[PDB]
Write an enzyme that holds these catalytic residues in place. Structure first.
Site, PDB file in Angstrom:
ATOM      1  N   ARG A  45       0.036  33.286  40.455  1.00  0.00           N
ATOM      2  CA  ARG A  45      -0.089  33.126  39.018  1.00  0.00           C
ATOM      3  C   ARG A  45       0.778  34.164  38.326  1.00  0.00           C
ATOM      4  O   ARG A  45       0.759  35.349  38.670  1.00  0.00           O
ATOM      5  CB  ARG A  45      -1.537  33.279  38.542  1.00  0.00           C
ATOM      6  CG  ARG A  45      -1.723  32.696  37.142  1.00  0.00           C
ATOM      7  CD  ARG A  45      -3.146  32.782  36.625  1.00  0.00           C
ATOM      8  NE  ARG A  45      -3.433  31.638  35.765  1.00  0.00           N
ATOM      9  CZ  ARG A  45      -4.420  31.577  34.880  1.00  0.00           C
ATOM     10  NH1 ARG A  45      -5.233  32.606  34.705  1.00  0.00           N
ATOM     11  NH2 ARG A  45      -4.615  30.463  34.191  1.00  0.00           N
ATOM     12  N   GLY A  69      -9.943  26.982  31.522  1.00  0.00           N
ATOM     13  CA  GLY A  69     -10.786  28.149  31.666  1.00  0.00           C
ATOM     14  C   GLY A  69     -12.133  28.023  30.986  1.00  0.00           C
ATOM     15  O   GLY A  69     -13.129  27.667  31.612  1.00  0.00           O
ATOM     16  N   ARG A  70     -12.165  28.299  29.691  1.00  0.00           N
ATOM     17  CA  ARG A  70     -13.414  28.258  28.955  1.00  0.00           C
ATOM     18  C   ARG A  70     -14.145  26.919  28.972  1.00  0.00           C
ATOM     19  O   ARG A  70     -15.373  26.892  28.930  1.00  0.00           O
ATOM     20  CB  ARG A  70     -13.173  28.763  27.533  1.00  0.00           C
ATOM     21  CG  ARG A  70     -12.935  30.275  27.516  1.00  0.00           C
ATOM     22  CD  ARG A  70     -12.302  30.763  26.227  1.00  0.00           C
ATOM     23  NE  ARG A  70     -10.920  30.308  26.110  1.00  0.00           N
ATOM     24  CZ  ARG A  70     -10.101  30.656  25.125  1.00  0.00           C
ATOM     25  NH1 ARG A  70     -10.522  31.471  24.167  1.00  0.00           N
ATOM     26  NH2 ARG A  70      -8.864  30.182  25.093  1.00  0.00           N
ATOM     27  N   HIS A  75      -0.946  38.773  33.657  1.00  0.00           N
ATOM     28  CA  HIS A  75      -1.834  39.472  32.731  1.00  0.00           C
ATOM     29  C   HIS A  75      -1.892  40.996  32.729  1.00  0.00           C
ATOM     30  O   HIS A  75      -2.937  41.583  32.430  1.00  0.00           O
ATOM     31  CB  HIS A  75      -3.240  38.890  32.909  1.00  0.00           C
ATOM     32  CG  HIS A  75      -3.284  37.401  32.745  1.00  0.00           C
ATOM     33  ND1 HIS A  75      -4.320  36.621  33.213  1.00  0.00           N
ATOM     34  CD2 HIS A  75      -2.408  36.551  32.158  1.00  0.00           C
ATOM     35  CE1 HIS A  75      -4.079  35.355  32.921  1.00  0.00           C
ATOM     36  NE2 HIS A  75      -2.926  35.285  32.281  1.00  0.00           N
ATOM     37  N   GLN A  88      -8.550  34.064  43.977  1.00  0.00           N
ATOM     38  CA  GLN A  88      -7.488  34.778  43.276  1.00  0.00           C
ATOM     39  C   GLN A  88      -7.631  36.243  43.671  1.00  0.00           C
ATOM     40  O   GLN A  88      -8.710  36.829  43.512  1.00  0.00           O
ATOM     41  CB  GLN A  88      -7.600  34.650  41.757  1.00  0.00           C
ATOM     42  CG  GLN A  88      -6.391  35.287  41.080  1.00  0.00           C
ATOM     43  CD  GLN A  88      -6.495  35.360  39.574  1.00  0.00           C
ATOM     44  OE1 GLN A  88      -7.434  35.940  39.030  1.00  0.00           O
ATOM     45  NE2 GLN A  88      -5.510  34.789  38.891  1.00  0.00           N
ATOM     46  N   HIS A 131      -2.541  37.310  42.040  1.00  0.00           N
ATOM     47  CA  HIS A 131      -2.588  37.583  40.609  1.00  0.00           C
ATOM     48  C   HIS A 131      -1.406  38.449  40.194  1.00  0.00           C
ATOM     49  O   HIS A 131      -1.480  39.682  40.211  1.00  0.00           O
ATOM     50  CB  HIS A 131      -3.886  38.294  40.234  1.00  0.00           C
ATOM     51  CG  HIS A 131      -4.223  38.185  38.782  1.00  0.00           C
ATOM     52  ND1 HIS A 131      -3.267  37.954  37.817  1.00  0.00           N
ATOM     53  CD2 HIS A 131      -5.407  38.266  38.130  1.00  0.00           C
ATOM     54  CE1 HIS A 131      -3.849  37.893  36.631  1.00  0.00           C
ATOM     55  NE2 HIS A 131      -5.146  38.079  36.795  1.00  0.00           N
ATOM     56  N   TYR A 145      -1.734  43.171  35.244  1.00  0.00           N
ATOM     57  CA  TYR A 145      -2.345  43.877  36.355  1.00  0.00           C
ATOM     58  C   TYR A 145      -1.245  44.489  37.226  1.00  0.00           C
ATOM     59  O   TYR A 145      -0.076  44.429  36.850  1.00  0.00           O
ATOM     60  CB  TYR A 145      -3.312  42.951  37.096  1.00  0.00           C
ATOM     61  CG  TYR A 145      -4.492  42.615  36.197  1.00  0.00           C
ATOM     62  CD1 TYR A 145      -5.343  43.621  35.731  1.00  0.00           C
ATOM     63  CD2 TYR A 145      -4.695  41.318  35.730  1.00  0.00           C
ATOM     64  CE1 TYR A 145      -6.358  43.347  34.815  1.00  0.00           C
ATOM     65  CE2 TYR A 145      -5.706  41.033  34.815  1.00  0.00           C
ATOM     66  CZ  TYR A 145      -6.531  42.048  34.361  1.00  0.00           C
ATOM     67  OH  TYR A 145      -7.518  41.761  33.445  1.00  0.00           O
TER      68      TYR A 145
END
Ligand SMILES: Cc1cc2nc3c(=O)[nH]c(=O)nc-3n(C[C@H](O)[C@H](O)[C@H](O)COP(=O)(O)O)c2cc1C
Ligand SMILES: C[C@]12C=CC(=O)C=C1CC[C@@H]1[C@@H]2C(=O)C[C@@]2(C)[C@H]1CC[C@]2(O)/C(O)=C/O
Length: 364
Positions: free
Chosen positions: A233, A323-324, A184, A100, A181, A186
């Site tokens: 993404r 993810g987690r 989010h 990414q 990316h 960025y």
């Protein structure tokens, strides 16, 4: 053995043996100076090689792109050499890995920018959040973001070239795919959102202008490598890290998606929620997205295996990125297939540190 989660899927130039993907996860354990990937990171990724596809932690396209202490880059010879070992490790286990690539833009701090200067963005507006730096002992610490400098028009081509060069580097490093990316809050998302983009030139205003940069980047990387090696993404619905998607988020999202489809890229990765609360996607919206993109669609954001099966079975998405659960379960695929319990998560060690809470989670 659920139902469809464990069936193959063609993802651009490669074939995933299952639809359980590892979402990009920033862990901030790289070596400084140099923002260099480590053997420990190599072991961490190798432990998770059974994933249908591993999407790496966000990685810098340039030194200017850096916004967090400990995040790796893919712009220097040392970084390329280190990533080469990591991708080889994943491949030795018959896995697939995408890198990414990001430019953090305003979510950064002057102390980690080249020359100690202010970071860049679409406009000179502070992110109003706290990024992660390292203290004198190398431990992660949260610090307020530095107000950015608005990129000058003549600086935009350079940004596009940095993404292009990073993708060229990704190919040499042995990555199977690249994920841009554009989510989010960025840099790319900073241009996409009216809340963070107040430009009066061709890169601000209408959705066409706001999406101009990301589409120029998509075209540049498709030309550099191949469209079937490119994924992207986005987090086009809701608010992420203080960056919303404007008053016409749905329509603007469909515009972007239709434009992306024209490039015939490998996949569209939709981050549906931020860590905090977030309005669920309507099936109607998912349908609008599905009919406009002809590549693989990856859903992500607090997904349950059941939700993944439901949406894949309905033909709305093709894979899910966890993810987690992947942080805590290297063999998540096997656990979900056998319906085995998962290791408990230890959020305290998500960012920074070493092996503890990183290569610490046992496999079955
Ligand atoms: C520790 C941590 C690091 C993350 N790093 C990244 C990242 O680098 N890039 C990105 O696009 N999202 C990142 N995310 C979001 C994840 O890719 C994912 O979408 C998110 O964890 C929500 O899904 P989950 O409920 O399965 O964890 C991060 C989330 C966590 C918890
Ligand atoms: C998960 C996240 C969100 C989206 C993304 O693409 C990458 C990351 C990694 C870093 C995370 C970030 C957050 O969600 C905000 C965090 C958690 C940040 C580290 C410190 C932080 O900035 C926070 O402490 C500020 O409040």
């Amino acid at each position: 053995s659920a139902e469809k989660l464990f069936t193959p899927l063609k993802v651009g130039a490669v074939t995933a043996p299952n639809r359980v993907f590892m979402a990009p996860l920033t862990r901030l354990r790289s070596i400084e100076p140099g923002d260099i990937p480590t053997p420990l990171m190599g072991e961490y990724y190798r432990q998770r090689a059974s994933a249908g596809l591993i999407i790496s932690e966000a990685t810098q396209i340039s030194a200017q792109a850096k916004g967090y202490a400990g995040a790796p880059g893919l712009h220097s010879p040392e970084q390329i050499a280190a990533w080469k070992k990591i991708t080889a490790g994943v491949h030795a286990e018959d896995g697939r890995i995408a890198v990414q690539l990001w430019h953090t833009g305003r979510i950064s701090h002057s102390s980690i920018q080249p020359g100690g200067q202010a970071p860049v963005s679409a406009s000179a507006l502070n992110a109003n959040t706290r990024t992660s730096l390292r203290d004198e002992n190398g431990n992660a610490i949260r610090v307020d973001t530095t107000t950015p400098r608005a990129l000058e028009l003549d600086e935009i081509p350079g940004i596009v070239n940095d993404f292009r060069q990073a993708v060229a580097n990704a190919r040499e490093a042995g990555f199977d795919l690249v994920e841009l990316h554009s989510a989010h809050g960025y840099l790319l998302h900073q241009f996409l959102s009216p809340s963070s983009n107040q430009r009066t030139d061709q890169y601000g205003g209408s959705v066409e202008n706001r999406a101009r940069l990301v589409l120029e980047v998509v075209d540049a990387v498709c030309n550099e490598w191949s469209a079937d090696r490119i994924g992207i993404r986005v987090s086009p619905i809701g608010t992420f890290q203080n960056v919303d998607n404007g008053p016409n988020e749905e329509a603007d999202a469909l515009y972007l998606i239709e434009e992306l489809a024209k490039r015939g890229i490998a996949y569209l990765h939709m981050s549906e929620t931020d860590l905090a609360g977030g309005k669920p996607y309507s099936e109607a919206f998912r349908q609008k997205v599905r009919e406009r993109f002809h590549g693989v669609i990856i859903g992500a954001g607090a997904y349950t295996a059941e939700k993944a099966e439901d949406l894949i079975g309905k033909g709305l998405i093709d894979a899910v990125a966890f993810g987690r659960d992947y942080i805590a379960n290297p063999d998540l695929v096997a656990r979900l297939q056998k319906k085995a319990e998962l290791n408990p998560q230890r959020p305290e060690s998500f960012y920074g540190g070493g092996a503890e809470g990183y290569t610490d989670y046992p496999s079955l």
